[PDB]
Amino acid sequence: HGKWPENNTSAGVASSPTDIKGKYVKEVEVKNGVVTATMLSSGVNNEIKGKKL
Amino acid sequence: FTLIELMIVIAIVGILAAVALPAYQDYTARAQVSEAILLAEGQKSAVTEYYLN
Numbered sequence A: 001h002g003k004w005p006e007n008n009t010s011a012g013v014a015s016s017p018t019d020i021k022g023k024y025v026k027e028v029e030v031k032n033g034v035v036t037a038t039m040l041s042s043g044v045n046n047e048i049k050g051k052k053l
Numbered sequence B: 001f002t003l004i005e006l007m008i009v010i011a012i013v014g015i016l017a018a019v020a021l022p023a024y025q026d027y028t029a030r031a032q033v034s035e036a037i038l039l040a041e042g043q044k045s046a047v048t049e050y051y052l053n
Ligand SMILES: *[C@@H]1O[C@H](C)[C@@H](NC(C)=O)[C@H](O[C@H]2O[C@H](CO)[C@H](O)[C@H](O)[C@H]2O)[C@H]1NC(C)=O
Pocket: A003, A004, A005, A006, A007, A009, A010, A011
């Protein structure tokens, strides 16, 4: 389609990001191609809880 | 006359019974206090293990 997908629905993935998730990951959103992933809460003490990649 | 030789015995008889016994039941305590600590050694990493994960 010649441009980065804004969002999940366009990317062709689970339209809700939260549905896409990990054991310690909260969600995964498409953001104009850039794939942001949000971490869960506890499961570690570490300064990641709810943080993003 | 010899009695002062007996005197000095009964001065040796009344012993101190050094505080280096009860300071070292307190440090014999430090031995088995350490025996409690050496238990704690196992939990150091296990408690940590929960704390980190
Ligand atoms: C998916 O991403 C592409 C780039 C969007 N297209 C444009 C021109 O920005 C899609 O949005 C289009 O389609 C939806 C479908 O309901 C809607 O009709 C919008 O008006 C269009 O722009 C993105 N798809 C979605 C579902 O947002």
